[PDB]
Amino acid sequence: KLRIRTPSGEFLERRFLASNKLQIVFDFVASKGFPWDEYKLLSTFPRRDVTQLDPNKSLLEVKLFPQETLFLEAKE
């Protein structure tokens, strides 16, 4: 369960199994108008940019907690 925030601050919710590649999450954000190219997926506490993490790695391996709030910012 990941809660992703649009740059306008609207929550987007979806559940993925930990076995799911990070790409699955990328596709989910790619569903809305948030391409990997144009938008970054940020984590806070800890502070990291999931965008640049390897898509093939499992959600467990990308060290995403069972619950994580994430944020979207334009890669400008």
């Binding site: 369960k1 809660r3 806070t44 506490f45 502070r47 944020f71």
Partner: protein, 438 residues
């Protein structure tokens, strides 16, 4: 009472914007990692924070740093109320101004040095009237949120306009300095600190209870350890953290005075404390005032010891005064001080382990920009047999080396460094190496 009520506890994570709860409690309250929460405290003060989960956190407790506690005007052991705040809007404009004391001497663009990287991609929840602390350039600056876009709360998000008007505000009477010493400045004495905490809890935080009960609270606490172990720190922290009046007696100072002026000053200290109770008196270098009768050559000295004994004995239980004193070993001091009424409790603050050394190093590098090459663990490991004071000095020496090196390169038009250049200056591992090698 209601499960939204929790007990304020110390913070594992030192981030200003973070509070911690047990997962059980988070589940019970239906809280998601990173959810903005609204906390209510005394003087009807409020604060907004990010919630995370701490394994160690007892279900009935909340962990918050001292920034939050101050904003909520609560102290450790107080109760707060937690409710969700999902109505958090990425606010447009915030206006923040520094408190005067914190910025004395600082001559930078506070935005670039402090504010910008604080807020940057942090998505920090802020409330109006909050005071937050940013560390850098070997200082820590306190800023108050004077105005926010949505009036109550806001999330400072990338596009949030941060404005500093550039007029340093005064400190209101209820506002406490974050430059005051607290438990967060003490590393390595976890268990000892815990004991002292328990000792002073009821007498300092719940004095009234002693009117209702006939049980006698501990009057004297003796802190024994080698020099530089942080005995003075502990006392001051406990005072600050419990909000108790702190009176310092320094052995040398007392003994510098002539004849009765010594004993007068002693009495005065006690009287003053009695008056501003609940209070902690701290006697630094107790061995100076009260050595053993063997080592006590001369009658004036014996008079002073005697006075102290009487003063201690004369402390009524209802006085709500705890006396803490520091010495090297119990064998240093007249054994009469360890009688029933007097220093009846001893805590041993000893040399720290590597783990403790690391915490101490961390504490003393908190306002410093450290290059990536810095391995504080290495430093911790190699600094066998070092006490806090040693480590603190090591950090200083490293900083000053760094400055020294840069001051040579500022041979161009650049001024005596600056707040900015100080903030741009990184202490490197080589700097630590120089210090360790010296």
């Amino acid at each position: 009472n209601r499960p939204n009520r929790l007990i304020v506890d110390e913070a594992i994570n030192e981030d200003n914007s973070v509070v911690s709860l047990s997962q059980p409690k988070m589940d019970e309250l239906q809280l998601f990692r990173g959810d903005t929460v609204l906390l209510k405290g005394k003087k009807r003060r409020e604060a907004v924070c990010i919630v995370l989960s701490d394994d160690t956190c007892s279900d009935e407790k909340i962990r918050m740093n001292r920034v939050v506690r101050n904003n909520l005007r609560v102290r450790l052991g107080d109760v707060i109320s937690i409710q969700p705040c999902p109505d958090v809007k990425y606010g447009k404009r915030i206006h923040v101004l520094p408190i005067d004391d914190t910025v004395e001497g600082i001559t930078g663009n506070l935005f670039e040095v402090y504010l910008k990287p604080y807020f940057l991609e942090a998505y920090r929840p802020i409330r109006k009237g909050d005071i937050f602390l940013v560390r850098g350039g070997m200082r820590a600056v306190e800023f108050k949120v004077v105005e926010t876009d949505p009036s109550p709360y806001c999330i400072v998000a990338p596009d949030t306009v941060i404005h500093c008007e550039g007029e340093p505000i005064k400190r209101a009477a209820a506002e406490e300095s974050l430059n005051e010493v607290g438990y967060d400045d003490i590393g390595g004495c976890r268990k000892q600190l815990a004991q002292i905490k328990e000792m002073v809890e009821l007498p300092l935080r719940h004095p009234a209870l002693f009117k209702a009960i006939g049980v006698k609270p501990p009057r004297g606490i003796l802190l024994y350890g080698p020099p530089g172990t942080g005995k003075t720190l502990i006392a001051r922290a406990v005072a600050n953290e419990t909000g108790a009046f702190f009176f310092l007696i320094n052995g040398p100072e007392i003994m510098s005075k002539l004849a009765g002026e010594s004993e007068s000053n002693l009495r005065k200290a006690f009287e003053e404390a009695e008056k501003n109770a609940p209070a902690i008196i701290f006697i630094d270098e107790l061995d100076a005032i009260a050595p053993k009768r063997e080592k006590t050559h001369g009658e004036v000295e014996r008079r002073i010891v005697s006075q102290l004994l009487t003063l201690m004995d004369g402390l009524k239980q209802r006085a709500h005064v705890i006396v803490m004193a520091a010495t090297n070993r119990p064998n240093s001091i007249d054994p009469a001080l360890r009688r029933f009424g007097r220093f009846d409790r001893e805590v041993d603050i000893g040399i720290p382990d590597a783990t403790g050394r690391l915490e101490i190093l961390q504490i003393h590098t908190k306002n410093m920009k450290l290059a990536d090459d810095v391995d504080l663990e290495q430093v911790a490991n190699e600094t066998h047999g070092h006490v806090g004071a040693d480590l603190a000095a090591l950090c200083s020496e490293a900083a000053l080396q760094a400055i020294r090196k840069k001051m040579d390169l500022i041979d161009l038009e650049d001024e005596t460094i600056d707040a900015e250049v100080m903030n741009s200056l990184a202490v490197t591992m080589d700097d630590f190496r120089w210090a360790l090698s010296q």
